[PDB]
Design an enzyme around this catalytic site. Structure first.
Site, mmCIF file in Angstrom:
data_model
loop_
_atom_site.group_PDB
_atom_site.id
_atom_site.type_symbol
_atom_site.label_atom_id
_atom_site.label_comp_id
_atom_site.label_asym_id
_atom_site.label_seq_id
_atom_site.Cartn_x
_atom_site.Cartn_y
_atom_site.Cartn_z
ATOM 1 N N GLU A 363 -18.009 9.730 12.535
ATOM 2 C CA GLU A 363 -18.772 10.454 13.866
ATOM 3 C C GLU A 363 -19.563 9.501 14.509
ATOM 4 O O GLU A 363 -19.306 9.019 15.779
ATOM 5 C CB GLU A 363 -19.497 11.670 13.654
ATOM 6 C CG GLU A 363 -18.568 12.914 12.935
ATOM 7 C CD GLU A 363 -17.114 13.147 13.807
ATOM 8 O OE1 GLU A 363 -16.256 13.462 13.282
ATOM 9 O OE2 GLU A 363 -17.309 12.836 15.079
ATOM 10 N N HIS A 372 -9.739 6.620 17.024
ATOM 11 C CA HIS A 372 -9.259 6.670 15.906
ATOM 12 C C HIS A 372 -8.212 5.400 15.404
ATOM 13 O O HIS A 372 -7.580 4.934 16.180
ATOM 14 C CB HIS A 372 -8.361 8.072 15.647
ATOM 15 C CG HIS A 372 -9.187 9.256 15.610
ATOM 16 N ND1 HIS A 372 -8.806 10.596 15.966
ATOM 17 C CD2 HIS A 372 -10.439 9.398 15.125
ATOM 18 C CE1 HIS A 372 -9.728 11.217 15.729
ATOM 19 N NE2 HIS A 372 -10.841 10.515 15.261
HETATM 20 ZN ZN LIG Z 1 -12.916 11.169 14.815
#
Ligand SMILES: [Zn+2]
Ligand SMILES: [Ca+2]
Ligand SMILES: [Ca+2]
Ligand SMILES: [Ca+2]
Ligand SMILES: [Zn+2]
Length: 405
Positions: A363, A372
């Site tokens: 995070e 990502h």
């Molecule tokens: Zn993530």
């Protein structure tokens, strides 16, 4: 035999795919094809067993495509010293382990960039860290146990740069409930679940091998060969805060003229358990708070919240550790009364839980501006998979370095 209150309503393959592809911004073949690329799965364009297996694994709640909302700014911090504020804690872990896990998650990144992170104590922070449960204040509600595990926002003002962790998950360091010990010969080292003692495998602490009822645990995988252990949280060994200085409770103990044989809340509104550390509180006025036992508090079943009771009778036999006997899915459960054959009171025992460390580092990658990675072993990969090594991978480094320094 039968486990009442065990609810099976997990979504069907099509509903799952529909929601998953919607939630992570993919919206079926075209969408599935994109999903397979993002995850590096075979690009079949079909809801195959590999794709379903992935939709079924715990992951980050941040969309893989699109964003949560329109964000202000170019989504990269422009000052090197970043501040963070931990606004609340999860009860699954010792507050110190939490502080440390976050500090370490930040260190993975200050290491390969000119950034530094300093802990602060106001909404003033660039990054506000928070544990929340469903609807928690920002319009992106969590989904109960196991869905998305957390999420965070890109760099910017407001909620931007913030990180939220779903407290419906069991938070840990990834290898079972984190239980720091007291007085063993293990220096206070944490329990190693599961551990082997005189054969048997234990996934929680036991009082067996003892006569005083003190729950303990090995601090390595095999006690039998290592002899290293410590005692688990027990009011029979110690108490916290209060004025008793840590001394164990004494049972029974008098309070308001009443005799108790267990901790109690009477006299408090904040549901905190406490006890007298002498046979009579009115006379000696000494007390302390009963530490909480996370290693053996069941989840779900018809007794979520209650403690495993060992030994407990299952099919006439005696069980003294969590078991999977009676189940085909191998999962661990325990009875919450000494006799399950008659009471049918049970719950699932704590699992490995999710590493607060790994998830937080992932995070914080978002709170710094990263998206990502499609590389399975990279930290910024969407899905959660527990690994022991350092988690930053080449891909994560190339990505954070493109933004900083
Ligand atoms: Zn993530
Ligand atoms: Ca902020
Ligand atoms: Ca969840
Ligand atoms: Ca939790
Ligand atoms: Zn949130």
């Amino acid at each position: 035999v039968l486990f009442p209150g065990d609810l099976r309503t997990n979504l069907t393959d099509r509903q799952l795919a529909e929601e998953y592809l919607y939630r992570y911004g993919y919206t079926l073949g075209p969408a599935l094809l994109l999903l397979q690329k993002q995850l590096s799965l075979p690009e079949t364009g079909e809801l195959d067993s590999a794709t379903l297996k992935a939709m079924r694994t715990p992951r980050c709640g941040v969309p893989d495509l699109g964003r949560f909302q329109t964000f202000e700014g170019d989504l990269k911090w422009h000052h090197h010293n970043i501040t963070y504020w931990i606004q609340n804690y999860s009860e699954d872990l010792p507050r110190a382990v939490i502080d440390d896990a976050f500090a370490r998650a930040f260190a993975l990144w200050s290491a390969v960039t000119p950034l530094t992170f300093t802990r602060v104590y106001s909404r003033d922070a660039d990054i506000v860290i928070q544990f929340g449960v469903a609807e928690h204040g920002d319009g992106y509600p969590f989904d109960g146990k196991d869905g998305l595990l957390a999420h965070a926002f890109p760099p910017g003002p407001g909620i931007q740069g913030d990180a939220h962790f779903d407290d419906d998950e069991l938070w840990s360091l990834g290898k079972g409930v984190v239980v720091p010990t007291r007085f063993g010969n293990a220096d206070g080292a944490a329990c190693h679940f599961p551990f082997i003692f005189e054969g048997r495998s234990y996934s929680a602490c036991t009082t067996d091998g003892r006569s005083d009822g003190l729950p303990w645990c090995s601090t390595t995988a095999n006690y039998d060969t290592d002899d290293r252990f410590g005692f688990c949280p027990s009011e029979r060994l110690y108490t916290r805060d209060g004025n008793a200085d840590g001394k164990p409770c004494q049972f029974p103990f008098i309070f308001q003229g009443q005799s108790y044989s267990a901790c109690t809340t009477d006299g408090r509104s904040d549901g905190y358990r406490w006890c007298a550390t002498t046979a009579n509180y009115d006379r000696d006025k000494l007390f302390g708070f009963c530490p909480t036992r996370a290693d053996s508090t069941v989840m779900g079943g018809n007794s979520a919240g209650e403690l495993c009771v060992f030994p407990f009778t299952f099919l006439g036999k005696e069980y003294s550790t969590c078991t999977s006997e009676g189940r085909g899915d191998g999962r661990l459960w325990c009875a919450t009364t000494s006799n399950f054959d008659s009471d049918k009171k049970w719950g699932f025992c704590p699992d490995q839980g999710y590493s607060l460390f790994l998830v937080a580092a992932h995070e914080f990658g978002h709170a710094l501006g990263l998206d990502h990675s499609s590389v399975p072993e990279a930290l910024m990969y969407p899905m959660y998979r527990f690994t022991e090594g350092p988690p930053l991978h080449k891909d994560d480094v190339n990505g954070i370095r493109h933004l900083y320094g």
